[PDB]
Design a protein around this ligand. Sequence first.
Ligand SMILES: Nc1ncnc2c1ncn2[C@@H]1O[C@H](COP(=O)(O)OP(=O)(O)OP(O)(O)=S)[C@@H](O)[C@H]1O
Lengths: 326, 422, 95, 85
Amino acid sequence: KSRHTMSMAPDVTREEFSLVSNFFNENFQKRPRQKLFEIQKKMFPQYWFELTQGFSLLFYGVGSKRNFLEEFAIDYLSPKIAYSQLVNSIPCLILNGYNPSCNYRDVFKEITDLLVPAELTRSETKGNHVILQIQKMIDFYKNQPLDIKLILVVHNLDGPSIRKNTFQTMLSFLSVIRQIAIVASTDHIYAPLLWDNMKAQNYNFVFHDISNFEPSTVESTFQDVMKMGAEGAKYVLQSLTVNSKKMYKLLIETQMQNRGTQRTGVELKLFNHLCAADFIASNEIALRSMLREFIEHKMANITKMEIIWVPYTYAELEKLLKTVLN
Amino acid sequence: NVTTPEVAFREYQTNCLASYISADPDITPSNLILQGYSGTGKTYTLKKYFNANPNLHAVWLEPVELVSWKPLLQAIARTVQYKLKTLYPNIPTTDYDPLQVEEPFLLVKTLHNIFVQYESLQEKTCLFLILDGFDSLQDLDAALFNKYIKLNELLPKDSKINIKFIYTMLETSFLQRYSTHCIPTVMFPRYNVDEVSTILVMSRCGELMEDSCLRKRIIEEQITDCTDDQFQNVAANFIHLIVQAFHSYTGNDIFALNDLIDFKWPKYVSRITKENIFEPLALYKSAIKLFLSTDDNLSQTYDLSIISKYLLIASYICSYLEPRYDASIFSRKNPRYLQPSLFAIERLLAIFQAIFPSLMKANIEVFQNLSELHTLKLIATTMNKNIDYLSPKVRWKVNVPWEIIKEISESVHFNISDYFSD
Amino acid sequence: ADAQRSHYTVYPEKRWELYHQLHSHFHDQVDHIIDNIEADLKAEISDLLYSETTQKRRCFNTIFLLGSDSTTKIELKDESSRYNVLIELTPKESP
Amino acid sequence: RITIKLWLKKDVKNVWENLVQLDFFTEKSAVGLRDNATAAFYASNYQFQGTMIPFDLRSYQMQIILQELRRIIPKSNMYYSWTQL
DNA sequence: AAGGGAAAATAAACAATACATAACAAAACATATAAAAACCA
Ligand SMILES: Nc1ncnc2c1ncn2[C@@H]1O[C@H](COP(=O)(O)OP(=O)(O)OP(O)(O)=S)[C@@H](O)[C@H]1O
């Protein structure tokens, strides 16, 4: 099974990747991107009018929408609605769904403090009373004068914590209230698996496409691939004793004398004698103790001759030869 | 020496319980096992002893109305000082908190505190504790039952009042774990077909001759002055037939007979005549219809919509259709008994797009009815019910039997039995 | 800059009026119909919860509300010299 | 080969209920009794999958094997030809 | 119309992966009491 693999790739370090990535995402398709941004700007009065009807507005589409939501929520809408009702403008409570550390307790503790504490609602705070406390919020809000006092934003609604099911139903009861406007965005292709006709009854979602093919700068940070071990032990050797460099150099030679697999490895006895030959290893214990340091940071393997072999590729070890060992 | 009662079918077992229980503590063995399944009247035959013995004192506890051992200790310690108040009201007491105990040390800590002020009594009096239903405690384990055996020996043995136990449990696989302790057991056998009917007639004559549903039907029909014995006969003719037309359905139960009587009784009452009171055999021939049906079940055409109906009919396909065969037989160019296999996502829409009447492309409402079907628990997740949205490794599966699929196939005129081929 | 911190708040027509006289007027017809079924559902549970005097009187009364949306709220009678309480148990609280 | 009431589907369940609590059958992978308290408490929070498949598909296994039934069931009973295969 | 013959199907041994649950950890939720700390007075 001769497969080309990501290990057999010309790799790129940390500062080299992120800088040339920053060059593309700020200079690749710049002119048509704001050219799209001016086209969709005329839809902004249409969103203002429908949002008076308490409609949970939901934005789908390819690409990141994070920049677009923050322009649309903060600068455009939130002072426009305060001027049209008649003083600080309408409070914006974003929810970063790409941040996995969102819970149901903490954000709702913000909500009841963002909303009015007209009564002693801490008396009803008791043991899951969250649905209980919001139910007492809802029926009171059915008989209030209709005006928006809060707009909340939920970025990346299919996020790693917001897509949890006890959190989803929590947002469902918020959306039936007329005083708050719910402007959220998702990115998943299976996002309408999240809602049944029970929740969408509470939601009354409407949909709009926004596809600007954004790079998702902030949304790439928490995500990881093998760019983010061959690269792990690449830094430990840069800070050690000078003898460990030499005893790894003698290790890496005869382990690449023969991918870097088990079969190219060496026996412990002769390697003790080999590192006794260059006046390096005194005995087995002095060898093994500064070999456990290569073991503790998982920089070498052993299987069974008593074969110690390096788990990095054929291409990687000669890169480890000519750069850091030399 | 004790005053034994007498009951219907416990003639051996009344003797042993009179044997293994005396008011004297020295003759009284410490721990005891009353074993038998539900449907033997052990709670009946135990209390029936105790009403005939007013000399002893019984404290009745009920584990089935508790949930755990931590209240069960609180159940014991609250009651003995409750009982000993009502047995020796002259004795002064530093009443302790039964809420305070939560650990098995704390009981014998508190029973060391309780019994010492009661030391001034005149003779060694015993005190029988009764636990009813020790196997159906809902947090039981291996190391709880032995934990209650040795409680007697941690007590001081020379106290004037001695606490001893009687354990009621069932599921005799459980008792086989503890036969090496060799505590004295009195097993209670199950019943036979006659003695089920014999128990049932002497226990249900007191209600079924005195029910107003009879008493209405007395004055509603032309009432001949039929005797209570004439009421006794038709009651006995009812019981001796209802156990005969149903014994294979119910086994040797008593509880399952005590309610099936109270379902078929007024429906039996309406089909009597003025004349069939003297005519019992023809009365059964006129009231026949209830004696061959169970009448315990209080087949739905399902509420869900059309696109959701085809959403169900594609989900049943992967109870037998493997990925090796399906794409060949469903081109756009038997495990009916067995447990269903595991889905993944988009294999549904792989089959759903094929079997739908290019005529459809919008899949927003199709995605709507999935989690609608998830709330109906007709298709459920293999894993926990939380992260199933974002496509991590999540496998799906149906939970509907074949018949409800078969009606719902013809309810949308779709044919399914062709594609199931052994 | 701050976007990795989660949930940080911040504190930054001739035609349409003829819509406004039509929209709410329609919605007065909506919600008045909504309380009708709300009064309907609250009524038919309430009479049926009471007046059912069975003869054995050692059984609970059960009610199956078929086709119901799992959100149907209930009110209770006062019915003095006896407290009448409501307990709700959501499958989230059924471990 | 001959008048015997063959029963339905909706009723055998009532007989099937007593048979599993007479321990003539077991559930397939069911550790019965935990040894101590905190091992049993770790099994209480665990939501199960066998209840999530329906009643008629819980894979029940056997406590009393077929060949031993021939030795206890008398030959006077009509099903004695069915003890042996 | 016959027929070649490649796609499709079947079976069986073996390897690789997923799954159900056991065991546990940890955070949310909850109470208790002696010591600090305000605080009237
Ligand atoms: N010898 C008898 N005479 C009269 N009635 C009896 C006799 N034996 C049993 N019964 C009846 O059988 C009924 C069964 O009562 P239970 O004690 O609950 O049965 P069980 O086998 O103990 O099941 P439980 O409650 O789960 S332990 C009693 O209520 C009595 O009415």
